[PDB]
């Protein structure tokens, strides 16, 4: 069965999937995206060197690709990230001028978002803002504009498409007692009550064996940050086992603002850990044991 449609007969909006042109064009990829997830983001195309690899000068095939091939078979989409470290060319990473940054951040975000304008749910707007300890990361945002740039990412990113939902993610909050997850509860708290427009925490988890358990209790701590939606990324899993992913679909189950599981990959071979064997499909394809134990969680 599609875990997509059981997850949607739950009450959630979607079963979602990581991807791009590079992996549509070959393969099984497609038709298993088409039968099993209902909502596809994209891995590389939409991060800023493949978007604007030189000022002004926007790059939008593969992103146009992926959001045609969306459209055309019926998937939501997810969108980022639009602020972060990763991904970042020499040419903004080099900037002084704090008048500079802002205004190439603004038409950044401004310009992507409005090409898509209404047809993006999700938008991973600011991504991977914390340290381990809660405080803030050194990025050349931080350094140059102050801790003023992320209300800026926001309230630009409003601006430009009022219809998406606009998140911030990071990693490493998959424990109620880390440091970390705590602190974006918090901070997250205190910028809505100034008006920052977050709609959405999304929990990058790389899990290893046995961290599934701990996602119980760290769920529903996301959650009190009050805003409309908590969404779960599961990047990595090799070393987990399906009691690893039963407890994370549970998690979502039971949290109510939580929307839908992202999973980053089809199939094993394609993982950045594709030998720990952390997904869903094999390198044959063919379904794990653990994506059985979704579809039976699921179930009835």
């Given at each position: 069965q599609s875990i997509d449609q059981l997850i949607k007969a739950r009450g959630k909006v979607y079963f979602g999937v990581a991807t791009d042109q590079n992996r549509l064009t070959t393969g099984k990829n497609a038709a298993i995206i088409k039968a099993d997830f209902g909502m596809v983001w994209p891995e590389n195309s939409m991060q800023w060197d493949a978007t604007?690899?030189?000022?002004?000068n926007f790059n939008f095939a593969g992103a146009d690709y992926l959001v045609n091939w969306a459209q055309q078979n019926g998937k939501l989409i997810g969108a980022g990230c639009l602020?972060?470290?990763?991904?970042?060319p020499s040419w903004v990473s080099s900037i002084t001028d704090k008048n500079t940054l802002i205004n190439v951040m603004k038409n950044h975000i401004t310009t992507l978002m409005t090409r898509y304008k209404g047809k993006?749910?999700?938008?991973?707007?600011?991504?991977?803002?914390?340290?381990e300890d809660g405080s803030l990361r050194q990025n050349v945002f931080l350094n140059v504009i102050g801790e003023d740039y992320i209300p800026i990412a926001f309230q630009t990113a409003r601006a430009a498409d009022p219809n998406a939902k606009l998140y911030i993610m990071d990693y490493n909050?998959?424990?109620?007692?880390?440091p970390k997850t705590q602190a974006i509860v918090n901070r997250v708290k205190q910028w809505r009550a100034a008006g920052?427009?977050?709609?959405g925490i999304g929990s990058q988890m790389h899990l290893s064996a046995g961290?599934?358990?701990g996602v119980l209790q760290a769920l529903p701590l996301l959650a009190?940050?009050?805003?409309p939606e908590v969404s779960i990324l599961?990047?990595?899993?090799?070393?987990?086992?399906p009691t690893d992913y039963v407890n994370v679909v549970n998690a979502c189950l039971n949290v109510?603002?939580?929307?839908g599981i992202t999973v980053?990959?089809?199939?094993?071979?394609?993982?950045?850990?594709?030998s720990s064997t952390?997904?869903?499909?094999?390198g044959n394809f063919n379904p794990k044991p653990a994506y059985n134990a979704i579809v039976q969680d699921l179930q009835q």
């Open positions: 604007e690899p030189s000022q002004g602020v972060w470290h990763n991904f970042l993006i749910r999700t938008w991973d707007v600011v991504g991977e803002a914390f340290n909050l998959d424990s109620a007692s880390y920052v427009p977050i709609d961290q599934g358990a009190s940050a009050g805003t599961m990047l990595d899993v090799a070393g987990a086992s109510q603002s939580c929307v980053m990959g089809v199939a094993d071979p394609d993982s950045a850990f594709a952390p997904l869903l499909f094999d």
